Amino acid sequence: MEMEKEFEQIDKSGSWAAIYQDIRHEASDFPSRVAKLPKNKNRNRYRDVSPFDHSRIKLHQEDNDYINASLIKMEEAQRSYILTQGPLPNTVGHFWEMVWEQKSRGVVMLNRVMEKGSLKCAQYWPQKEEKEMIFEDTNLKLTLISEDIKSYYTVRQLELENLTTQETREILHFHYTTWPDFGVPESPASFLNFLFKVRESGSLSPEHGPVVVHCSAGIGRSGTFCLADTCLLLMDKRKDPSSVDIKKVLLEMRKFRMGLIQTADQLRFSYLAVIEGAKFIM
Numbered sequence: 001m002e003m004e005k006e007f008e009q010i011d012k013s014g015s016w017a018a019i020y021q022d023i024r025h026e027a028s029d030f031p032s033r034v035a036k037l038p039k040n041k042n043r044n045r046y047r048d049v050s051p052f053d054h055s056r057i058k059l060h061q062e063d064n065d066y067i068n069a070s071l072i073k074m075e076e077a078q079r080s081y082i083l084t085q086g087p088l089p090n091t092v093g094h095f096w097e098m099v100w101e102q103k104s105r106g107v108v109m110l111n112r113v114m115e116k117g118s119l120k121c122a123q124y125w126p127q128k129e130e131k132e133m134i135f136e137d138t139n140l141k142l143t144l145i146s147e148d149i150k151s152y153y154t155v156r157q158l159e160l161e162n163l164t165t166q167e168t169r170e171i172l173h174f175h176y177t178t179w180p181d182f183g184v185p186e187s188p189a190s191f192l193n194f195l196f197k198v199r200e201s202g203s204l205s206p207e208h209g210p211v212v213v214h215c216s217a218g219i220g221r222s223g224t225f226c227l228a229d230t231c232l233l234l235m236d237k238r239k240d241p242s243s244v245d246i247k248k249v250l251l252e253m254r255k256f257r258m259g260l261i262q263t264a265d266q267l268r269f270s271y272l273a274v275i276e277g278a279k280f281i282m
């Protein structure tokens, strides 16, 4: 079926939970043996969210190459994304090592450091120009260059230096700051505006390594971001945009990381975002 009318048909019939459970039942199951090794327990935020072995990002290290991060490679859309958990106190150096080694231009953050009164990820970037951060375990230096605070999101320019080679690179930090503590946003308008700002920066384009996108677990809000982006790109590429099937695209993405889209409300929000976004594109 088309999307907008399939949408109203699920609303009128109140069957979002049943649609979402079908997706959960059909989703791929692949091994995640490296994630579960005892030496990696303090590298995982949640025991039930792990990268598959076949798609995990490897750190360029011989001691321990593990990080909780996955490469989502969308062949028809010609887009790639790295989805990862919010960094932990003992993985902030690994996080920036990955950004460096994978040649990423942008980092997309969809959570606040504190939500619901609890810490959802480490404070992993510097908040003042004159107070830079050094990660001694991976030999990197990170400096805040500029910050632009808007009503729904903040964009930061960061300088990452590899202290071993003295090479430097400019990284863009795109921080969506207004996702509610509970539920999903009422309108997709600010989320779509944010997606378009990431696109306009070049961070999603083939001349760079894959964008790094995270929330707390790296599957819920993060899944919504890449699902919406890929579906809108396919609607621009195909002769028949009504042929784009958001459930099929989501199941393709779940071949590369488990659990993408965590609730039926996130599924409905993803539909809403693609529907409204397709009208603005034209």
Ligand SMILES: O=C(c1ccco1)N1CCN(C(=O)C2CC2)CC1
Pocket: 188, 189, 190, 192, 193, 196, 276, 277, 278, 279, 280, 281
């Ligand atoms: O593609 C874009 C776009 C291009 C340039 C700037 O934005 N958008 C904007 C937001 N959209 C909405 O429907 C908002 C609810 C108004 C549609 C998608």
